């Protein structure tokens, strides 16, 4: 269907403990494929999915080069912004960036993005037209000026439209057997008695990809979320995901309940019962 590539940059200062640490991670869809950590004994851009390992020496040195320039750029960014806000020399501060692109089922540019955050809140973002900026505050406006007078917008658009999309498609082709493949959740229901009168029924979805999924409980055929305990969808560590939803029910009434699971990997919605 539709696809995305995204890069996440984070720079966090540590006054009295060294120079700002810089970390980057790249994603295609829900799949991380690259990483960089300034604190690594030998900082380099490293592969996190089989289908990038094939990239040649010139790729990895170019990426490593880019990340080292990145850490320098964001270090300046932190220092400059720290000046804008006239903050105390005290504690840590953070500068984050997420950028990348969405391509439709046709393989064309749907939307490009490139937004920055300072200390966990929007700071400045490239608007959907890839030509203007939204400054979240007085300081970000100063930055806006600098970027407009430097023509940063055009530079970003050139990459978001061309390079970003091309390579996204490339990675998509190169990793097709996993990126364009959906794994269906393996589902079951567990039984946990609380007392002689109440028991918990937990409905599990394990080993699925992608992350997006839906779990719900029904009584006699009619919903009843408000009574349902979820956990946030979590990563198994094997690139797949997990989730459960539970409901406390009267001992003896287990039959009345059915768990319902919808996921891209299932031909048709599934129905479980204890």
């Amino acid at each position: 269907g539709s696809h995305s590539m995204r890069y996440f940059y984070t720079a966090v200062s540590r006054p009295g403990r060294g120079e700002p640490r810089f970390i980057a991670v790249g994603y295609v869809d829900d799949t991380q494929f690259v990483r960089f950590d300034s604190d690594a004994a030998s900082p380099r851009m490293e592969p996190r999915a089989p289908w990038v390992e094939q990239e040649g020496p010139e790729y990895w040195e170019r990426e490593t080069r880019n990340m080292k320039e990145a850490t320098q750029n964001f270090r300046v960014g932190l220092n400059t912004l720290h000046g804008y806000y006239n903050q105390s020399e005290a504690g840590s501060h953070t500068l984050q960036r997420m950028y990348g692109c969405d391509v439709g089922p046709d393989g064309r540019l749907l939307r490009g993005y490139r937004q920055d955050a300072y200390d966990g809140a929007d700071y400045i973002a490239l608007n959907e037209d890839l030509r203007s900026w939204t400054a979240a505050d007085a300081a970000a406006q100063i930055t806006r000026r600098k970027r407009e007078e430097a023509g940063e917008a055009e530079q970003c658009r050139n990459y978001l439209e061309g390079t970003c999309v091309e390579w996204l498609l490339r990675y998509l082709e190169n990793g097709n057997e996993t990126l364009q493949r959906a794994d269906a959740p393996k589902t079951h229901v567990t039984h946990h008695p609380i007392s002689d009168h109440e028991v918990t029924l937990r409905c599990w979805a394990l080993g699925f990809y992608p992350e997006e999924i839906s779990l719900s409980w029904q009584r006699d055929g009619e919903d009843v979320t408000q009574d349902t305990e979820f956990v946030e969808t979590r990563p198994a560590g094997d690139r797949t995901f997990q989730k459960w939803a539970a409901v406390v029910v009267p001992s003896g009434e287990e039959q009345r309940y059915t768990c319902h699971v919808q996921h891209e990997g299932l031909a048709e919605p599934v129905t479980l019962r204890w």
Binding site: F8, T10, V12, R14, I23, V25, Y27, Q32, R35, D37, R48, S92, H93, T94, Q96, M98, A117, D119, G120, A121, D122, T190, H192, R202, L206, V231, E232, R234, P235, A236, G237, D238, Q242, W244
Partner: protein, 99 residues
């Protein structure tokens, strides 16, 4: 503004006493990105703990996955201990095999 981290402790595959598994500690929703995470067996630090790379979500909050090999038994306990500036005390969550 600081955000307290949310913690989930859970195995990679369904738990079977004596059967080699992977224990996960999933930490999310925290800010700033500075954080210390250890995993405990019976209350004692575990040497080899792997640490995914720190990433972040739409709301800019951070998440990271720590994990290590382990063999679940009837008696042995397991915990994740997280230390973060948003809390005064380290937060400890014990693994429940039913969750």
């Amino acid at each position: 503004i600081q955000k307290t981290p949310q913690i989930q402790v859970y195995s990679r595959h369904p738990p079977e006493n004596g059967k080699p598994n992977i224990l996960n500690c999933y930490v999310t929703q925290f800010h700033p990105p500075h954080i210390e995470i250890q995993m405990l067996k019976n209350g004692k630090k575990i040497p080899k703990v792997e640490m995914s790379d720190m990433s972040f979500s739409k709301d800019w909050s951070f998440y990271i996955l720590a994990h290590t090999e382990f063999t679940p038994t009837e008696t042995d306990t397991y915990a994740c201990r997280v230390k973060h500036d948003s809390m005064a005390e380290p937060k400890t969550v014990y693994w429940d095999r039913d969750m």
